[PDB]
Amino acid sequence: IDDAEIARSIALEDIDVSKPELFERDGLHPYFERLRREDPVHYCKASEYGPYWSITKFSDIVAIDTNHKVFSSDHTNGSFVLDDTTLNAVDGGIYLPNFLGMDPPKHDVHRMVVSPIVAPQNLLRFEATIRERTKRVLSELPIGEEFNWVDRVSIELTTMMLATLLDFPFDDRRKLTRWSDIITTRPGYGLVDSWEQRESELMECLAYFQRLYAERQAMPPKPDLISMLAHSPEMQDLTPTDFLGTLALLIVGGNDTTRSSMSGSAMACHLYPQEFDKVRNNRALLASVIPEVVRWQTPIAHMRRTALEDVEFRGKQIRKGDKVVMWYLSGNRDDEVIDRPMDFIADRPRARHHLSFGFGIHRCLGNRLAELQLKILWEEMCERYSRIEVCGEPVRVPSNLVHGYIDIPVRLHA
Ligand code: HEM
Numbered sequence: 122i123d124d125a126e127i128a129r130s131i132a133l134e135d136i137d138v139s140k141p142e143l144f145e146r147d148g149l150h151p152y153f154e155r156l157r158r159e160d161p162v163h164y165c166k167a168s169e170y171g172p173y174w175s176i177t178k179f180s181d182i183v184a185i186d187t188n189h190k191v192f193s194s195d196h197t198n199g200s201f202v203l204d205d206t207t208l209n210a211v212d213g214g215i216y217l218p219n220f221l222g223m224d225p226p227k228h229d230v231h232r233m234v235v236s237p238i239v240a241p242q243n244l245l246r247f248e249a250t251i252r253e254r255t256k257r258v259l260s261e262l263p264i265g266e267e268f269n270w271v272d273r274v275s276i277e278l279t280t281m282m283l284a285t286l287l288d289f290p291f292d293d294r295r296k297l298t299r300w301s302d303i304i305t306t307r308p309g310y311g312l313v314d315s316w317e318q319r320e321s322e323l324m325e326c327l328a329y330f331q332r333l334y335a336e337r338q339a340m341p342p343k344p345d346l347i348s349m350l351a352h353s354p355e356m357q358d359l360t361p362t363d364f365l366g367t368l369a370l371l372i373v374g375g376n377d378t379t380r381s382s383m384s385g386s387a388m389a390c391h392l393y394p395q396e397f398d399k400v401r402n403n404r405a406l407l408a409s410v411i412p413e414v415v416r417w418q419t420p421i422a423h424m425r426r427t428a429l430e431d432v433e434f435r436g437k438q439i440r441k442g443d444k445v446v447m448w449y450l451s452g453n454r455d456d457e458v459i460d461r462p463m464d465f466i467a468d469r470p471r472a473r474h475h476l477s478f479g480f481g482i483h484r485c486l487g488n489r490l491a492e493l494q495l496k497i498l499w500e501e502m503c504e505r506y507s508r509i510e511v512c513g514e515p516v517r518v519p520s521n522l523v524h525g526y527i528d529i530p531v532r533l534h535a
Pocket residue numbers: 186220221222232286370371374375376378379382415419420421424477478479480481482483484485486487488490491
């Protein structure tokens with residue numbers, strides 16, 4: 122398929138950027154280029170998820186994200202992703218309510234329970250712990266033999282990081298990757314064969330975490346996420362559904378995003394070897410490289426809202442009940458705000474000014490944890506490797522939400 126030809130040729134009204142097939146072949150940029158130029162607040166009438174608004178420009182996306190009283194995230198209105206099966210009991214899905222899918226006032230009550238995980242002193246302890254654990258993984262990677270970087274680096278380090286945050290048994294940490302993966306999938310997408318199989322694996326997740334929760338309730342408070350839920354007065358009446366929904370948020374939130382950033386790091390070093398060379402020669406560039414990895418990869422391609430009011434936005438009449446989608450993958454390529462945004466630039470000015478963590482009351486809680494783990498990985502790459510070679514076909518995730526990789530064949534050079 123030639124996405125450039127279609128995007129030039131078809132009527133504006135027939136553009137649907139939501140198809141997971143487009144993400145699998147990273148074919149979105151010709152469509153987004155046309156929408157940002159010709160119709161930046163665009164109504165799509167025909168899609169699998171019903172009709173929706175696409176918000177494609179940087180400034181416009183900030184406006185939606187920061188107006189939570191007009192543009193709702195609440196689970197009672199359908200929650201915060203475009204595909205209604207991921208978090209609602211519809212068409213084979215199950216109900217997964219959580220504080221990212223809550224509007225105020227309840228949102229703030231739940232966020233405050235887990236916000237100590239990024240207290241300053243915990244970030245310092247976390248950084249010291251991660252450093253040694255990361256060193257140990259990287260020092261066993263072969264030189265001059267092909268391996269899947271997603272398997273040996275992205276998953277290996279990400280599941281070690283999330284296990285540290287949950288104090289999850291280290292020997293079972295592969296379960297965290299499995300549970301994360303099935304939350305954002307559908308039957309036939311290559312992970313589960315049925316909705317029922319998905320439901321079974323999530324009940325197994327619930328049973329495992331319930332055992333851990335009961336253990337944490339009976340020991341002193343510790344700086345781990347399950348401990349924080351287990352000792353919180355305001356969390357004592359979670360229904361089974363709310364508990365499972367909250368676990369889903371913490372498992373996917375810390376897993377899929379960081380994994381995708383680690384996979385993008387390898388792609389960046391191969392496609393832009395001179396930028397890797399720069400930071401290797403000058404380690405002060407880590408400050409600008411890490412936010413740029415996250416902007417360039419954009420691990421979460423969109424977040425979705427539902428309008429609670431009729432509202433005229435940039436000249437367009439949004440109606441109460443309409444789906445509104447913030448395309449972070451488009452916004453992070455808006456050259457009104459970001460110069461030469463298709464390329465990876467180790468040394469970019471105002472490198473923290475990107476959309477990948479959102480803006481407003483739902484801005485990513487764990488952004489400092491991700492950035493510290495990515496810093497430590499780049500420190501180690503810089504010390505151990507002359508270059509990172511992608512030597513076979515990359516295989517991408519079929520999702521309009523998770524913007525990441527299944528397979529990146531690499532060879533390391535020293
Ligand atoms: C590069 C890594 C990451 C990216 C790109 C990312 C992206 C996001 C985005 C896009 C949101 C929603 C923003 C909005 O709607 O305005 C979010 C929220 C959240 N993230 Fe992250 N995230 C990352 C790492 C992490 C990690 C490591 C954790 C936990 C250990 C985490 C936990 C959360 C939580 C709990 C929320 C909900 C905040 C709320 O509703 O108040 N994230 N993240």
